[PDB]
Structure formats: structure tokens, C-alpha cells
Amino acid sequence: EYQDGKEFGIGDLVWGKIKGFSWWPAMVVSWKATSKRQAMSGMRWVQWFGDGKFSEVSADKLVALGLFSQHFNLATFNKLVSYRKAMYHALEKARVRAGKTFPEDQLKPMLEWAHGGFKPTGIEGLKP
Ligand SMILES: C[N+](C)(C)CCO
Question: Within this chain, do residues 2 and 23 fall inside the same structural domain, yes or no?
Fold first, then answer.
């Protein structure tokens, strides 16, 4: 599965771009978790953080969540509570992988950690 030359595999934290929406954090999942069908070649199934729904998204419309400051949308973040909730669950998942520990208020330092480049592991720590 996902043997098509393009990147991103199961478990990868990514940003996903759907028409009409900001880049949104997601996890790449196997089609078996979706209750649907296999993804077409060059597509990935993702599960979106925040609402837990599934979309078949092209790999050209995905980037690693580690490319954070370049895809984090600050306007959308200020405008939409769903996007903030999405960011929380995405970064929380990121934190546990990277073995990072912290002391809306919970978000603030995870956001800073993410925006600052996921110190000290860097993006390496975000891998599944
Ligand atoms: C995460 N999006 C809002 C882009 C789609 C949710 O199903």
C-alpha cells in the first residue's frame, strides 16, 4: 500500500490542503481504517485532526507537519476554534512522538515549540 513513488507513509503527521480550506493538520492512515476503498495511486488517505474525518488527498497536496511555520495559518488560527482544537491534538500527538514535555493555555507553548522548529529533536522527532 502507498507503493507509488510519492512520499508520505502510514502514521506521518502532515498538513493537508482541501479546496476552500487552510492547510489542515492530519495523520496519514491506511485505507483499512477508513471503511471506504483503497486510495488511487498518488493519493493518501488522511484523518484530519480536530474532526477525525477521512479524505483521499493527493500526495502533492500534502507536506510534512514539520514544515510548520510555513503552513500554520495565523489568521485561520485566530478566526476558528476548530482549527485551534485541531492544532492542539496534532501538536499533542507530535509532542509525545518527539518525547517532548511541557508544564488555549496548553496550546501556547506547544505552538511556540512547533513554530520554533520542534527543539530539541527537530522534525526528526515527529516520525511515527
Ligand atoms: C479538515 N477540513 C476542515 C479541511 C476537512 C474536515 O473534514
Answer: yes
